[PDB]
Amino acid sequence: SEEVVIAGMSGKLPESENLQEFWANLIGGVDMVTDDDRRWKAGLYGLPKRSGKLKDLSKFDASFFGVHPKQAHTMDPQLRLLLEVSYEAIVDGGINPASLRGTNTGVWVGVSGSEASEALSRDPETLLGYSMVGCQRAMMANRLSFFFDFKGPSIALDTACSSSLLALQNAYQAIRSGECPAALVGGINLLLKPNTSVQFMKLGMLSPDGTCRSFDDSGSGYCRSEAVVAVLLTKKSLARRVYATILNAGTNTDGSKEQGVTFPSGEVQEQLICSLYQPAGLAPESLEYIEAHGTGTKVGDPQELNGITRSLCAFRQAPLLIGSTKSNMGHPEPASGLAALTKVLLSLEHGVWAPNLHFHNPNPEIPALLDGRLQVVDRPLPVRGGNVGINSFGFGGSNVHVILQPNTRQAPAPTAHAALPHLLHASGRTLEAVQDLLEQGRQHSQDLAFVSMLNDIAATPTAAMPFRGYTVLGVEGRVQEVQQVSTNKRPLWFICSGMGTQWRGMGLSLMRLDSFRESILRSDEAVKPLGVKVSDLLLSTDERTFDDIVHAFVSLTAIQIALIDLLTSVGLKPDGIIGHSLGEVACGYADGCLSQREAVLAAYWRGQCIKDAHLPPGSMAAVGLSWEECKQRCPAGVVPACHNSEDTVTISGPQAAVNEFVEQLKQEGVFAKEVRTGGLAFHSYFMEGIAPTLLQALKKVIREPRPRSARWLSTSIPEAQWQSSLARTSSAEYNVNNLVSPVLFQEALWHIPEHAVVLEIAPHALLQAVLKRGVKSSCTIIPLMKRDHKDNLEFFLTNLGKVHLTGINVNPNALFPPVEFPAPRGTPLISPHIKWDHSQTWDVPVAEDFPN
Ligand SMILES: *C(=O)CCCCCCC
């Protein structure tokens, strides 16, 4: 009573470096059996020249897997390959391995030989202990468990040829029962030692021509082959990708047989199949296809298919499609079950059955081939729908059978709201690793599930995946960056900018994201009573809307909250918050001191209370002087208002002594420009007369002032005084002090640590230059919006991209409506686009490392 699915798969098979190459060979009808000298001189000892072999055994990203080089040279290639294939298989499922660490996830590996362990133990004087650690069969599973921190069962099992499908049947049982949430299931087989082939030849088990002629009259033995295959199973609840569901699996053993231990009992094979179908409530009628063991043997093939005839065809009207992967690539012995499995799932994902090779004349000892009750797939056929069975048998008598219900979910009808641009992250071991995943994005941008899933696997520790990239999909250009990443952890700082960041139609672009639009609608709910709507102000044809002080104050705050609402939804929590002027209202909200209604109302009243009040005229100017040298050369009346950098400082004072300090300053050609303030001298004693009206209004808005965290640095209160009762809370008192006191901005930037990532939360990034000049060189500075820029959603995505690029983990899936998993059938494979760093080349045992 727990539904088990096949979530993810990867492999290397003969002439197939990954499952895309394997699929190309299958649907292409390319024989993957070869007669070159890769493993040993062809014909040696009178052996068949033909065998299925891997393109390469020498490559292993040793350092990603925490394997030191001395250890990698003395590790069974089986394991080196299975670590890579196992990683491949998990992420293929759209599952971040991190999510399975520390869980009771189990590992089961079919493996029948470590030829390598004999090779590397031959010379006592120069052998290495690490060779025990890298070749002992338990490790073919125990190493997987160790690397992935999987704490369920970790078991290497031998039932000869049925071993890997038995591993499937065990992982299945462990998940059906609740013992395990998930399970990695492996099959491995290599042909390093020729003496092993000689054994099989002399037993009469090998076709001289190296061909599994499955189901054919001339079947006279099998072709030995290599395989490395990994499959992730999960309970349905955890799945994103779902190739198929396991309706049922089981194993029996032939037991006693007159004919001998290695004669395959079709009667007992039949017993096994009969036990799994009607008794479990599954009709043979519901099978479209059976993957037979199909080794192409005088005895095996008739025993097997006559079994299939009596157990399944006997209770069917339609013919049963049958096939065997062994025709295509040979028998990879214990890996047979999982090789056969991948052929079945690739066929289903592509909507076409790959055909057998070598099916010329049917085996006349098999009635159901001659009367068409069993119909060999000898030519690509469309997948018409139905369950799938798979057989795997060992020479000792172990039988396994697995029923699959293929996943047939179609993707949903395209919507108008998804014509939005999307953002794709990727991490990687190499530049090519990232470029390839991002190229798969571009190619399949309309596939919501694929992109969603690629985003999930991008969140990775940076010591392991030192290259990151993003790209924006759904936009005219080629928005993409990729780079090396830091290692050291990178604190995230929010800077909420102040005034001068307003512009006509600001935030209209972002109103397509729902978290943003929903923040603006909440903000509108605060100021409905006070007779204004932020949505309508953003929507204003009218050029001078944000010339009204209340319109600007409520809207800049409203948007700063909406941006903080987006960042929060993609998982970004600030380590430090710094405000500038009006900024300190949003900072409050970021820091969780101000509710959203408090923050938005605070901004309205700060505005309304300045409108209503009669204040001594002053002016404000920006001047190319430092904090200090400005105080020196200042008239009386004129005060340094905003300490921005050591380059820029904003002054305030009376309209006369300012429009005289600009001119006396341009004699010396110095940066000096009076700013539009509607004739108010902010951050000075000219604002003192706002305190009575505003302190009352805010007292009624911020009823129960809440503590400010150590993460929010005041720019309104000097550091010396951060311990005061005023600075304790975002009080009505705090927000009045803000308007009449200087902005101690540079003073606070000093406190931003090394390697920090600094985001300017503002509808235009005014403070970029200032921030750069004010914070340490290490620190990365990132804007979120710019005025009159064609698409601001594209600019936001682009800049979220830049955050992911710093090694800070961002998951953009949350910006758009969630994908409904399981992912639709035919979502593209991820396993083939996981590139490694194969720069190094590792020892492989060779024929002469074994005796003669
Ligand atoms: C399948 O039953 C053939 C025998 C498996 C042993 C392979 C490795 C020694």
Author numbering: 1 to 852
Quote the study that presented this structure, word for word.
De novo fatty acid biosynthesis in humans is accomplished by a multidomain protein, the Type I fatty acid synthase (FAS). However, FAS is overexpressed in cancer cells and correlates with tumor malignancy, which makes FAS an attractive selective therapeutic target in tumorigenesis.
Herein, we present a crystal structure of the condensing part of murine FAS, highly homologous to human FAS, with octanoyl moieties covalently bound to the transferase (MAT—malonyl‐/acetyltransferase) and the condensation (KS—β‐ketoacyl synthase) domain. The MAT domain binds the octanoyl moiety in a novel (unique) conformation, which reflects the pronounced conformational dynamics of the substrate‐binding site responsible for the MAT substrate promiscuity. In contrast, the KS binding pocket just subtly adapts to the octanoyl moiety upon substrate binding. Besides the rigid domain structure, we found a positive cooperative effect in the substrate binding of the KS domain by a comprehensive enzyme kinetic study. These structural and mechanistic findings contribute significantly to our understanding of the mode of action of FAS and may guide future rational inhibitor designs.
